[PDB]
Design a protein around this ligand. Sequence first.
Ligand SMILES: [Mn+2]
Ligand SMILES: [Mn+2]
Lengths: 138, 138
Amino acid sequence: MLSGLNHLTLAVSQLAPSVAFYQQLLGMTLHARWDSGAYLSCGDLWLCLSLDPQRRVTPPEESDYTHYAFSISEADFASFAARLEAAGVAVWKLNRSEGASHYFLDPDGHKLELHVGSLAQRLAACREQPYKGMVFFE
Amino acid sequence: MLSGLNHLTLAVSQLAPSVAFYQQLLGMTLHARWDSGAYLSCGDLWLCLSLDPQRRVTPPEESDYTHYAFSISEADFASFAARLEAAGVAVWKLNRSEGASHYFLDPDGHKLELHVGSLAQRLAACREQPYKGMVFFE
Ligand SMILES: [Mn+2]
Ligand SMILES: [Mn+2]
């Protein structure tokens, strides 16, 4: 039986700028790097960056909605989002609202998100303002 | 400061076969569904399936190494992999490293993995037998 996410592996086209993005700008902890990868953590999350010459930098309009959201507190959300905008990090657009979120791209065009709130809080919000056709299983 | 992974969103081409795969085959808990998505959990992982007309069923040779690994115990690993094999789930890679991994595809070609073991266990192995160019940060 599955118990959660073991690790997230992102393919990257150039290792050094990606390590710098996740460690220096997003503040994740760097544990190890080698010629073809790096291991970082973000709380409980094990993040692996893997050098892949097949990774292309894709515009957000021609990639699908697959994306990765990181937790941040209400108190830090706005100041962190402002730091990203000031550093020139690019943005993307989702088709729907899902609460307090900031959407941004990594250097290879992976779609990232800062989000405030848990699944339980999301479900409670949706009971009041549901998506079209929403059904709940309790 | 970021405190971990908040949610993982996968773009899907058809909602019903993807719900069947994650809920029934993989055993995740379905919390809600709407006309264009679903919310599931797997342990502490919040998974969102988002219906996206841009999502292509993508062969594994046409996508990069980006992938998502789920936690499982060693005791459960072999029987879970056999279940996937009975259901006809395709494998995209053989495990060639130490530690138990099974690499399988979802119905849209998202690259998934079953893995036994933590980041700390991987770092311990790498300290004994480091990869080419490996540097550690304490
Ligand atoms: Mn999201
Ligand atoms: Mn992996």
